[PDB]
């Protein structure tokens, strides 16, 4: 994820790693 | 679907923290 293009489910993979157990939102 | 941002460009670690709840 170190400077990569987060497309589709790849965006969900990193947001689960960055936010951790805090949750996130991406759509919409 | 018709729009993406961290996919076209590259988001850093701080920009991903702004998408968290």
């Amino acid at each position, epitope marked *: 994820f*170190v*400077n990569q*293009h987060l497309c589709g489910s790849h965006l969900v993979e990193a947001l689960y790693l960055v936010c951790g157990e805090r949750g996130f939102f991406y759509t919409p | 679907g018709i*729009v993406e*941002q*961290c996919c*076209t*460009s*590259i*988001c*850093s670690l*701080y*920009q991903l*923290e*702004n*998408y968290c709840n």
Partner: antibody
Framework: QIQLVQSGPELKKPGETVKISCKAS????????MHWVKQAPGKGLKWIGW????????TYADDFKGRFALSLETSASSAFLQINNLKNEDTATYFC??????????WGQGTSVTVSA | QIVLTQSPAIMSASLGERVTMTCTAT???????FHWFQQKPGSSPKLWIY???NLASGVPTRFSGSGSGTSYSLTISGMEAEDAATYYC?????????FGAGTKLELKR
């Protein structure tokens, strides 16, 4: 149509602070990102940073961290570049680039500031 | 962080000649994040070729891009008077995006 209009040319003294704008039109400003590229007088192109228009979180390159800030205005659908403590090496042309289909597509005008006495 | 080395920095060519410039990176670059920009004196840079080989809306068909990995190239079939400008190559990968040194295309006489 897709059109990016930048602010007029700026005249600043060394140590001052300048804040230029870049108004977007013809598309949803919040749906696509905004980039910024600097061009020294008659030299190459150097990347500064880009802003997440969906959120507002900006980032910058290693050579632009600190004295360079990036803001937005959702009501006017525009981006802003602010440089703090202007140096003689900051005299250049600053371009704002969009990012609809690909990175830095549809540029716009280009504001050139001169940092001198 | 990857350095795009364009060669030659300056080059001349007469009308109708096949102009070919080169851009070389320090590491492997995906073809989807390699582009070409054409800048004329007194005008903002415009996206000339995106994704290695795709022409923009407005570029004449005489332009063609190619290359993969660490070596890419921009080729003009028939050199025209309006093709005299500076051409930059662009990337997007492991680091903030990098630009090339630029290739100043001048008309030969």
């Amino acid at each position: 149509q897709i059109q990016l209009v930048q602010s007029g040319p700026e005249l600043k003294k060394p140590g001052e602070t300048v804040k230029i704008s870049c108004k977007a039109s013809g598309y949803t400003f919040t749906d696509y990102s905004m980039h910024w590229v600097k061009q020294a007088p008659g030299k190459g192109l150097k990347w500064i940073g880009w802003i997440n228009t969906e959120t507002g979180a900006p980032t910058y390159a290693d050579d632009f961290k600190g004295r360079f800030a990036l803001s937005l205005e959702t009501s006017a659908s525009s981006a802003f570049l602010q440089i703090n403590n202007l140096k003689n090496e900051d005299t250049a042309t600053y371009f704002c680039a969009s990012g609809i289909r690909h990175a830095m597509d549809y540029w716009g005008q280009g504001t050139s500031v001169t940092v001198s006495a | 962080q990857i350095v795009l080395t364009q060669s030659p920095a300056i080059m001349s060519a007469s009308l109708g000649e096949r102009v070919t410039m080169t851009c070389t990176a320090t590491s492997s670059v995906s073809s989807s994040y390699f582009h070409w920009f054409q800048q004329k004196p007194g005008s903002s840079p415009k996206l000339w070729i995106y994704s290695t080989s795709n022409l923009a809306s407005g570029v004449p068909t005489r332009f063609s891009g190619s290359g993969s990995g660490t070596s890419y190239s921009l080729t003009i079939s028939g050199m025209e008077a309006e093709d005299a400008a500076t051409y930059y190559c662009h990337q997007y990968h492991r680091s903030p995006p990098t630009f090339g040194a630029g290739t100043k295309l001048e008309l030969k006489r």
